[PDB]
């Protein structure tokens, strides 16, 4: 087998061993459920919808939230498109491009919403009949195996190199277990479960940081050895 | 940190900025209990007598006096701002923020030099002065 897939195997084993060592039993806690408490308040209603419809709704809501965040200081010269690319409407002056600055948290949220938009758009393309079910599966696999190319997440949080490298390793594993025998190289692999899991496990840890940042930004309000003397 | 005069409302801060016509009004925005503010206030206290000919130093608690938090972006543990004749004198420290000193210094002579540069530039009628030292790096080796 090629050197790259062998390094893929070794890196996957490294991640497995590191996870096994660093495992600690979950801390005891009182069972508090976020969505159950959402239902308790009057601000949330319940229904049943197709997953594609909810995906479109979530994409639109995330776009609206980002637009609200972008046009918070009345920065009308910054435009967010529907693919979640922050672009200027004009040739910005130096002061304009300095005041139009956002932290790494904002861009990380934008790229996360961009990934969700990519997934929901692939599902919509499947639902419109433009692409086949096999094509939809292969596109979903390509999305999770090439998050570094489709989105610039690693730029705003370089720890996602771990997730990106893991996705590349899983791509190598699945491709070289898949493109064997009569099956050759080329698109059509599918089997997007691995990258899907990887990025959802990334999200379960990246959620609290973005929750805290968004809550601080959207609110109405914004040892001894050193100073012992 | 506690030996310096304190301003207890926004009107007092405005009057302190307005009162001094021939001296730089150095005002530190923060909290007396914050360690970064403790360091900055110790530095300001060490130089308070030296610069009394061309600078006056006041301390303002941004929780007791929150009237300038939105205006001056006082959302840092410590912040030092310069005013001369009711005008905020910006300084090009090289940190990307030319409006304030949002960290704590360790050299008295450094702060004295910055105060002197601000005083000279403001006397000449300038809204921005260039700091004698750059702070794009901490010069740690």
């Amino acid at each position: 087998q090629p050197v790259k897939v062998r390094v893929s195997y070794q890196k996957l084993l490294k991640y497995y061993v590191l996870n096994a060592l660093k495992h600690r039993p979950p801390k005891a806690q009182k069972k508090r459920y976020l969505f159950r408490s959402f239902k308790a308040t009057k601000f949330f209603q319940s229904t049943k919808l197709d997953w594609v419809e909810v995906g479109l709704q979530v994409c639109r809501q995330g776009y609206n939230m980002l637009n609200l965040l972008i046009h918070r200081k009345n920065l009308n010269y910054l435009h967010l498109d529907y693919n979640f690319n922050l672009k200027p409407v004009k040739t910005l002056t130096t002061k304009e491009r300095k005041k139009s600055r956002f932290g790494n948290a904002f861009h990380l949220c934008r790229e996360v919403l961009r990934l969700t938009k990519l997934v929901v758009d692939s599902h919509v393309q499947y639902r419109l009949g433009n692409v086949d079910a096999f094509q939809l599966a292969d596109g979903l696999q390509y999305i999770f195996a090439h998050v570094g190319q489709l989105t610039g997440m690693y730029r705003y949080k370089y720890k996602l190199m771990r997730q990106i490298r893991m996705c590349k390793d899983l791509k190598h594993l699945i491709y070289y277990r898949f493109n064997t025998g009569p099956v050759g190289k080329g698109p059509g692999c599918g089997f997007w479960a691995a990258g899907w899991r990887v990025w959802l496990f990334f999200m379960r840890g990246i959620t609290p940081l973005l929750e805290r940042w968004l809550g601080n930004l959207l609110a109405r309000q914004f040892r001894v050895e050193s100073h012992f003397d | 940190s506690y030996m310096l005069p304190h301003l207890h409302n926004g009107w007092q801060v405005d009057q302190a900025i307005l009162s001094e016509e021939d001296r730089v009004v150095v005002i530190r925005f923060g909290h007396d209990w914050d360690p970064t503010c403790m360091k900055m206030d110790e530095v300001l206290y060490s130089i308070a007598e030296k610069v009394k000919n061309f600078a006056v130093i006041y301390l303002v608690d941004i929780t007791e006096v929150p009237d300038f938090n939105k205006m001056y972006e006082l959302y840092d543990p410590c912040t030092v701002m310069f005013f001369f004749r009711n005008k905020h004198i910006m300084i090009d420290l090289g940190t990307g923020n030319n409006n304030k000193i949002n960290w704590a210094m360790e050299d008295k002579q450094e702060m004295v030099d910055i105060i002197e540069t601000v005083y000279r530039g403001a006397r000449k009628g300038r809204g921005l002065v260039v700091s004698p030292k750059d702070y794009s790096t901490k010069y740690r080796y």
């Binding site: 972008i70 918070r72 200081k73 920065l75 300095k98 005041k99 139009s100 600055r101 956002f102 932290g103 948290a105 904002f106 930004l217 609110a219 109405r220 309000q221 914004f222 | 005069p5 304190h6 301003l7 207890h8 409302n9 926004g10 009107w11 007092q12 801060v13 405005d14 009057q15 900025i17 307005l18 006096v65 009237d67 300038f68 939105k70 205006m71 001056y72 972006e73 959302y75 009711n86 905020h88 990307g96 923020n97 409006n99």
Partner: peptide, 30 residues
């Protein structure tokens, strides 16, 4: 003057004609 209280109906921002500044958009309550 130190110790004197603020006069009623006084805005410490425009009382002396102070002008604010913005370094970035991710800082400040909208």
């Amino acid at each position: 003057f130190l110790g004197m209280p603020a006069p009623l109906g006084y805005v410490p921002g425009l009382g002396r004609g102070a002008t604010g500044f913005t370094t970035r958009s991710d800082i400040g309550p909208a």
